[PDB]
Amino acid sequence: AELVSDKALESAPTVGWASQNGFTTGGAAATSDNIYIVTNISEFTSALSAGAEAKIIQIKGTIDISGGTPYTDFADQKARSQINIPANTTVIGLGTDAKFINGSLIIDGTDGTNNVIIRNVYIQTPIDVEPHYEKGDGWNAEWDAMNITNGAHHVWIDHVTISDGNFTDDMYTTKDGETYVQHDGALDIKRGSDYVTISNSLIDQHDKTMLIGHSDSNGSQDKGKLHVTLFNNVFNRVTERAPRVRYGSIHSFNNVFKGDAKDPVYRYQYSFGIGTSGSVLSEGNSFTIANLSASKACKVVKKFNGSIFSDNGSVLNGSAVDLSGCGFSAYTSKIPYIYDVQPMTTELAQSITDNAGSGKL
């Protein structure tokens, strides 16, 4: 088919881990027969059957992963809603309304998947029709909006929006006296995945958001992996884990975090979660957290079992913040790529906010 997006052929920028030890070009080398315009789930799966062949899949409008058929139970949702994105694929949204609902985009490296670009699309977090119960933890949801797993590498997520959308957590019902949690994580990066760049994106209205490194006992696979760069993104109304990391090495700069410690639905807990053997280099970020005083500035970064965290030039509610006394050891690893941390001002924060997410490419 014809290429509608004049930015569809672009590869990841020189900045970011997705451009280290190889380039992330997605399906830029696709032949005309492998350039698609999909308008529904059937056409989407058809396009994806090209497998590891270079392909460009242009998304028009809303793609209902359920195909208009509600999931009857866990098994049904598991069998139909987890859409795998193969190697050398560029999924790019057309216009301002390219969207996915009722499902998860899975970048699974088991088959060797690598070199994937997901861009300019909105993904509404899926609703688990059959949460599982765990004594002492309550109800738990299984499905995320996007998952990068099993060694998948060289992935560029750009101008993507992930949000609970039309079903927010205040709408949860109660079952057996406990909140019937139907939302899982937003974006997961785990099991040896590596070389990822997340740019100009928006995560809006969600609880358990971005977990990088899913288990403390999975070091054999995650040690020295999970390098992720995040810049010019907006994390709005997100409860926790803007980036909670285990084993991975995170570079987060010029991102905008907006929340409220007293939000009625997505109460701000913290932004950076420093887990087992995890490391975060935070630079020139903007934290605007209502009901969070300067004296409690360390709340933006929470220690779990990790200890590596450094911040350079970030701000809290408009003023420079010092987080050097929050109890962490400095991030000493070198950043291999050249990058430019712009001084964070309210003007820059607004610019980033105005350009973040799908429909803004």
144 is in an annotated binding site: yes
Strand partners, 134: 138
**241 catalytic residue (yes or no):** yes
The active-site residue out of 119, 191, 237, 241 is 241
108 is in an annotated binding site: no
- What is the chain's length? 361
Query: DSSP string covering 321-360, please?
Result: ---TTSS-B---S---S----PPP-HHHHHHHHHH-STT-
Half-sphere exposure of 58 (CA within 13 A, CB side): 20
Q: How many CB atoms lie within 10 A of CB 4?
A: 14
- Is the CA virtual torsion 130, 133, 139, 140 positive or negative? negative
Characterize 120-152 residue by residue with b for buried, 16 or more Cβ atoms within 10 angstroms of its Cβ, and e for exposed. Answer: bbbbbbbbbbbbeeeeeeebebbbbbbbbbbbb
Please choose, from the candidates 111, 57, 104, 105, the residue with its C-alpha nearest in 3D space to the C-alpha of residue 87. 111
Helix (H, G, I), strand (E, B) or coil at 19: helix
- Token pair 């019902």 in the structure block, residue: 173
Q: Residue 192 corresponds to which tokens in the numbers above?
A: 């040896």
- φ/ψ of 219, rounded to 5, equals -60, -35
Strand partners, 132: 140
Beta strand pairing call for 132-134 and 104-108:
unpaired
- d(CA 61, CA 169) in angstroms, rounded, equals 25
Question: Which value, to the nearest 10 degrees, does the dihedral of the CA atoms of residues 210, 212, 215, 220 take?
Answer: 170
- φ/ψ of 26, rounded to 5, equals 60, -135
Strand partners, 105: 83, 146
142 is in an annotated binding site: yes
222 is in an annotated binding site: no
- DSSP annotation of 41: H
- Token pair 């009901």 in the structure block, residue: 291
Annotated binding site for Ca(2+): 142, 144, 184, 188
Q: Active-site residues: which are they?
A: 241
